[PDB]
Amino acid sequence: SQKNGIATLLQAEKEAHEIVSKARKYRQDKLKQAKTDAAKEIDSYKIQKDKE
Amino acid sequence: DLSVRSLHDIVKPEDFVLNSEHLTTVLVAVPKSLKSDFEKSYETLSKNVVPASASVIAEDAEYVLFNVHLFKKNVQEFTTAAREKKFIPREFNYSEELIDQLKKEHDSAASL
Amino acid sequence: LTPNQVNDELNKMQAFIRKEAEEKAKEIQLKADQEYEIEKTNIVRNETNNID
């Protein structure tokens, strides 16, 4: 057969697809928020110098 | 010869479940007399065997055919052992893009 | 052997697939945090000099 020790592995690898997709999504979100923080901290630094 | 013939009626998804890889199958063709070397090696052969992957699958009355599904990490042991138990190394899988080639070529040769 | 113990090894393998997926996702998150920090610091350093 092919339904013993495989279909359970099929569900396992579908869960693997889901988990790796989660990790990818966290990669993109971390990158995006990294750039956002980089752009906003410099903005605050700028709003300091005009007041200076 | 029944060992060199390119089979086109036993390869199927139901025995070649080509999907997200977990296993590694292989076809076997052994004479009838040596059937004890494989039958009595039902599960002492090695680890990582697949249930119903050694039971009766197909018999040609001269060779016996199965689908030896071993996992995708411990292929080394059975690959090494295949050279001392007379296993045919013809790596076949469910791939119509090659199955159709032989039939089309034979018919075209006859027609030409 | 008996079909049950090979089934126990099968269970070990369903556990293995998910364990490996979780491990790789964890490593992905770790390197995600590292790139978070480094990328955020880069533009911060650059602009702290440009605005100066």
Q: Which of C17, C39, C51 sits opposite A49 (nearest CB)?
A: C51
Among the listed residues B105, B99, B77, the one whose alpha carbon sits nearest the alpha carbon of residue B16: B99
Whether B48 contacts chain C with CB within 8 A: yes
Secondary structure element (H or E) that encloses residue B49, with its range: none
Q: How far apart are CA B84 and CA B38, in angstroms?
A: 12
Q: How far apart are CA A42 and CA C44, in angstroms?
A: 6
Q: Which amino acid is at B46?
A: S
Under a CB-based contact definition with an 8 Å cutoff, are residues B4 and B79 in contact?
Answer: no
CATH number at residue B22: 3.30.70.100
Whether C1 contacts chain B with CB within 8 A: yes
User: What resolution does the deposited structure have, in angstroms?
Assistant: 4.2
Among the listed residues A28, A45, A36, the one whose alpha carbon sits nearest the alpha carbon of residue C46: A45
Task: Measure in Å the smallest separation between the Cα of A51 and chain C Cα atoms.
Answer: 13
Q: How far apart are CA B32 and CA B36, in angstroms?
A: 9
Cα–Cα separations (whole angstroms), residue A52 to A49, B22, B31, C47 = 5, 64, 93, 17
Residue indicated by tokens 């030896």: B68
Residue A30, sorted as left (phi over 0), alpha (psi -120 to 50) or beta, turns out to be alpha
Breaks (C-N over 2.5 A) in chain A follow: none
DSSP codes of every residue in A29-49: HHHHHHHHHHHHHHHHHHHHH
Q: How far apart are the first and last CA of chain A?
A: 77
> For helices A7-51 and C3-50, what crossing angle results, to 10°?
10
Cβ burial of B27 (10 Å; 0-12, 13-18, 19+) is buried
Q: For residue B71, what are the β-bridge partners?
A: B23
At A38, phi and psi to the nearest 5? -60, -40
At B27, phi and psi to the nearest 5? -85, 150
Domain boundaries, position B23 = 4-93
At A28, phi and psi to the nearest 5? -65, -40
Q: How far apart are the first and last CA of chain C?
A: 76
Tokens of C4: 């049950």
Tokens of A15: 């869960």
Chains that touch A (3 or more CB pairs under 8 A): B, C
DSSP codes of every residue in C20-44: HHHHHHHHHHHHHHHHHHHHHHHHH
The alpha carbons of chain B give a radius of gyration, in whole angstroms, of: 15
Interface of A with C in 6-45 (CB under 8 A): 8-9, 11-13, 15-16, 19-20, 22-24, 26-27, 30-31, 33-35, 37-39, 41-42, 45
The contacts of residue C28 (CB under 8 Å, 6+ apart) are: A20, A23, A24, A26, A27
Whether C19 contacts chain A with CB within 8 A: no
Adjacency order of strands within the sheet including B63-65: B30-31, B63-65, B58-59
Among the listed residues A3, B49, A1, the one whose alpha carbon sits nearest the alpha carbon of residue C6: B49
Cα–Cα separations (whole angstroms), residue B68 to A1, B15, B34 = 11, 10, 17
Given CA atoms C28, C30, C32, C34 in this order, what sign does their dihedral have?
Answer: negative
Q: How far apart are CA B5 and CA B17, in angstroms?
A: 22
Chain C residue at shortest CA distance from B23? C13
Q: Which of A2, A9, A10 sits opposite B14 (nearest CB)?
A: A2
Tokens of C29: 């998150």
